[PDB]
Design a protein around this ligand. Structure first.
Ligand SMILES: Nc1nc2c(ncn2[C@@H]2O[C@H](COP(=O)(O)OP(=O)(O)NP(=O)(O)O)[C@@H](O)[C@H]2O)c(=O)[nH]1
Ligand SMILES: [Ca+2]
Ligand SMILES: [Mg+2]
Ligand SMILES: [Mg+2]
Ligand SMILES: [Mg+2]
Length: 166
């Protein structure tokens, strides 16, 4: 069956693991355990196609980010995640996109910009700001909450739909 290799990247603490775990395991991880490099695999039907998602959950903490580029290298599509209550994580997106372009040696990599923790009210990144960033990259912006599940399936499936357009 069709396999899609997805890679989730972004600053430490933005909720990359919580998003992936909500998608794959249907629960919310409340605690914060920094990730090194974890992978998840699940068979799902997306738009009538049975496919296998291989999701690489990467480190956002600089300390844990050792061979991250070697992992990212294999990815077919990337979720670039920031948190809507973490302005620095949004500003950091530029450098993740540059890293993706570097590891794929392409200016045209399937990507979706994700603004996570949308269940929280300490918003410092407004939707329009993120929409504009994504527009400049030619990719979709989607807000999510790993806590409530809002947008979670949408984000990951939209990434599959972007890979399919390339
Ligand atoms: N309220 C809320 N909290 C969230 C959300 N997503 C993640 N969190 C919380 O944010 C903290 C960090 O989440 P985590 O998924 O571990 O972040 P990460 O990006 O994978 N961190 P790292 O890069 O170090 O591996 C956790 O305490 C988690 O519960 C969300 O959508 N809403
Ligand atoms: Ca929990
Ligand atoms: Mg993590
Ligand atoms: Mg390269
Ligand atoms: Mg502002």
């Amino acid at each position: 069956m069709t396999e899609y290799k997805l890679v989730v990247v972004g600053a430490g603490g933005v909720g990359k693991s919580a998003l992936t775990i909500q998608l794959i395991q249907n629960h919310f991880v409340d605690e914060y355990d920094p990730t090194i490099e974890d992978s998840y695999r699940k068979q799902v039907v997306i738009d009538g196609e049975t496919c296998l998602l291989d999701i690489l959950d990467t480190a956002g903490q600089e300390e844990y980010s050792a061979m991250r580029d070697e992992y990212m290298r294999t990815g077919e599509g990337f979720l670039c995640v920031f948190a809507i209550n973490n302005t620095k994580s949004f500003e950091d997106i530029h450098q993740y996109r540059e890293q993706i372009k570097r590891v794929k040696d392409s200016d045209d990599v399937p990507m979706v910009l994700v603004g996570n923790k949308c269940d929280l009210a300490a918003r410092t990144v407004e939707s329009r700001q993120a929409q504009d960033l994504a527009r400049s990259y030619g990719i979709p912006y989607i807000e999510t909450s790993a806590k409530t599940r809002q947008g979670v399936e949408d984000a990951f499936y939209t990434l599959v739909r972007e890979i399919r357009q390339h």
